Design a protein around this nucleic acid. Sequence first.
RNA 1: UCUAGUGGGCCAUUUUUGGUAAGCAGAACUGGCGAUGCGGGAUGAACCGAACGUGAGGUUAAGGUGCCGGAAUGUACGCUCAUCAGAGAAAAGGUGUUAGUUCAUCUAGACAGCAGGACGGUGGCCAUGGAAGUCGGAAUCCGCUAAGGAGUGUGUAA
RNA 2: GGAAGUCGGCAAAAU
RNA 3: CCCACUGUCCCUAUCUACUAUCUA
RNA 4: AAAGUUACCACAGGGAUCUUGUGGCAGCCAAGCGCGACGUUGCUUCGGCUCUUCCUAUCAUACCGAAGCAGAAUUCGGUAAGCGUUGGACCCACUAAUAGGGAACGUGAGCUGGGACCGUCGUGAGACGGUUAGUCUACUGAUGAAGUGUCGUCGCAAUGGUAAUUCAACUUAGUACGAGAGGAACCGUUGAUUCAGAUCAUUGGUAUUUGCGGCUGCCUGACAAGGCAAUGCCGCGGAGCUAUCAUCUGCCGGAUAACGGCUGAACGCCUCUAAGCCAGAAUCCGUGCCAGAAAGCGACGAU
Lengths: 335, 94, 35, 23
Amino acid sequence: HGSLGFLPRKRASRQRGKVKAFPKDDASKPVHLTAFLGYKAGMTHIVRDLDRPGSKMHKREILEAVTVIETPPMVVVGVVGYVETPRGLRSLTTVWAEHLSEEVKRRFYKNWFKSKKKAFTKYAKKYAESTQSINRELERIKKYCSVVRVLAHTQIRKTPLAQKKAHLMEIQVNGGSVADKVEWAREHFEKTVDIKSTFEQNEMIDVIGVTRGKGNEGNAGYMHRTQLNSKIYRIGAGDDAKNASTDFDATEKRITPMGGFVRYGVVENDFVMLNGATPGPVKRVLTLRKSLLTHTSRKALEPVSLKWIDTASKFGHGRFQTPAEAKQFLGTLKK
Amino acid sequence: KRMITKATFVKYERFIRPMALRQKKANVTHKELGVTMQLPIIGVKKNPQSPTYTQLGVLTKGTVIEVNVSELGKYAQITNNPELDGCVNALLLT
Amino acid sequence: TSGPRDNNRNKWAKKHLKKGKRAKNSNFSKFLKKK
Amino acid sequence: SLKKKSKRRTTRLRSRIEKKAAE
RNA sequence: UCUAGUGGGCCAUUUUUGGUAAGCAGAACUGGCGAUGCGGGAUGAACCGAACGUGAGGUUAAGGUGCCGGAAUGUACGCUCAUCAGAGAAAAGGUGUUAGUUCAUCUAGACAGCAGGACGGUGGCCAUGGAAGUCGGAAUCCGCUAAGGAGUGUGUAA
RNA sequence: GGAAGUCGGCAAAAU
RNA sequence: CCCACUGUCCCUAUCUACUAUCUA
RNA sequence: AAAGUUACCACAGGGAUCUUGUGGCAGCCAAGCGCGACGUUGCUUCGGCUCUUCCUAUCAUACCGAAGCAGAAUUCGGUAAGCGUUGGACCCACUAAUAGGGAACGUGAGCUGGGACCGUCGUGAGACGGUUAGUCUACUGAUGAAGUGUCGUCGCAAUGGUAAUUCAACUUAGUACGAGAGGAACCGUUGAUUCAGAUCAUUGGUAUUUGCGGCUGCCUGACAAGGCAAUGCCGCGGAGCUAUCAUCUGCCGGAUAACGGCUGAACGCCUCUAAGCCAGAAUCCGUGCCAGAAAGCGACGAU
């Protein structure tokens, strides 16, 4: 058999990979976030210069397989205050935003269509009527609670996914005093937080998610897993047309490979490219978290400058990055 | 099985006497002289345990055995247990 | 070879936290924070 | 026990201890 | 007079016979079980009490009284700290503790500590690159003192 | 790769 | 013994039917 | 004339039926209580594959102590079972190393290999028969009714499990050290083995995509047209699965043992120890990772 630290080998009790540990809080650092939620689209292979001192491929180039995760900006819909107790952390109270998008309202219902859409109705009414209760609760969190987690949901509509329920979750707000975290959450109420503001493509992060099920084996598969030290290679912007165009390559193109991502679609929003494989198949939600413990060796610290990113047809033996140059080489078709 | 389980010195031979168990030289310590001399085992005089053992020449505790004393034949009593000590340590009858 | 729980290795990890780490990561968080 | 070995002894073990004490 | 059932064993004590690596083996001895439940020994064929109709009350045996558990977290005096406490392997080891027993010094100053001496024949006598007390082998004398060895060890090529 | 498997070219493919 | 051969093996992987399973 | 004897005895019958590392013997002493310790003199059926764990009485890995231990390579001795301890035929080579054991019939309901009686004929001797006689539970995962009004979302974490291993290369170096011969190490750095968890961009494999093409044969009088053939045969073949035949990733704190010390009595000195306090092993306990009490719980939304 395998390692005894992973048994009992049973199905994960959650579709979305839940964070089990957040980086330790620091008052010296100002107020920011630590985790983000994305959707796996697939991976390609890229050619990257190797600036690895002491290595035998120093000042050379290697080919690396890199997973692409679409990460549309996340909407902060609430905040949760946690108070330390002799029996552990306890959720003291929760404050939600006044207006919640249908994407996050669909989470509370198994049948949103048959529902009367009554979620947060009186909550929105009391929010508009009197703000003294909201002020009392926020003052309660900043005075008593020691850990602050913002409720954020993903804009699943932008992703080419048939699912319309947003994966609501909590992001621990590490940095500054408790009042600073509360002020940060209130300012960011109803707004959007971007992965460009959270991660910046040169740090060492961990990816967590549920693996894909292999059926029945002599149970094997569909288990919660935590990959450590997955390096971000590029946080590409969806709007920019140079997202998949490096400086050594030009050739204006998009990260979505020609022919589309297999069983996922076309990536149009901000995407994240991580070195190596990540758990879960395509179209499954993955969670990203910062480094709990600081460890930047040369591999985790060296800068990265991509040279060429493959966008060939992953469906089948693709042999052309873009239909433009495909038509330039291939003879003119009958159509 | 039928064999001699004790160290000895070499129909009538109904049992089997192991060659390894058999011993031919005995360390005899003189009484007056107080010196141990390795003399050949000329023969077994009498074994108080059993006349058959005496006939078979089994070297046991208290058995009388004759050894050459020309370099010093005289009898001697075995004061040790050859089956356990591994050596035929006896004291001269003098 | 020594394992990851080597007491000296933990000591050297602590020493290198304030040498090739820490400060360059704190301001790195600050930059995307003010963003 | 708490040490390596049970202080409590087997009943036939106690009796033969009494027998060994007698002889 | 006559008429049923019984003709085994087990365990233990004492004496004794040999013993034997060490077990034990052989008698005798009266017990206990065997035909017999009960209280206690955490549990039990053999251990401590006790021997039996059905009940009420009182009092005990053996054993117990922190809680499980009925009954003093009673009284008085001591011992013990175990980084494996406590409820034959045995000859010993321990700068572990407590009492004693004996013998020694001690205001002629007890030990301990500081300040010193720790000498002269003599480097006694040999030994060998050499060893002057302390490479080594034999002697083991001496004058002076308050006391200093033919030297307690370090040391020295010596 | 080619019997390194197993006590072993057992079964297959080769012919 | 030599040569050839091969999932016997390194080290297993995939496919097919049947079985296996549930229902009346 | 026979009689005794037989432990030289033989053939039938009857009864009985804890363990490990120190040699012995004989003397000389011999603290002591005739013994007499330590010392001293002599002389010389079993047997092995897999497997699971476990023990340390430790082969390697980690750290110390000692030794004429310059360095390197060792030897011996401590703590130490975390982690390993191969591949082939007394070898063999690799390897960091190829340690010793338990599961009392190790794991034969994981696994395999290397007759008795009676009779008859019988001198000192052996064979030629008739009867015969065997005897629910645990674990792996999977649902699951339910207190908590009801349903749902986001979480808390009691508790249980745990995981990483080893090597050689760069630099420090041809320096420390050494007549020379030789020749370190720490920090830092790059790779590789063993294991673990994933993944399918690329590569290989796979063909019921019966997807396309080619071939053979068959059937429609012919041409063509098609359709066929238990998946007839061959080439390619997506998608999926899959491969140390492909690719990624594998963490931090203290507390200690051996041991080295500090202050410091006991004991006017001294002393790492008694009260105290540091340094210190791959060890221990946490963190991280997995599970989430299906009779542990919180916040929130709606009613």
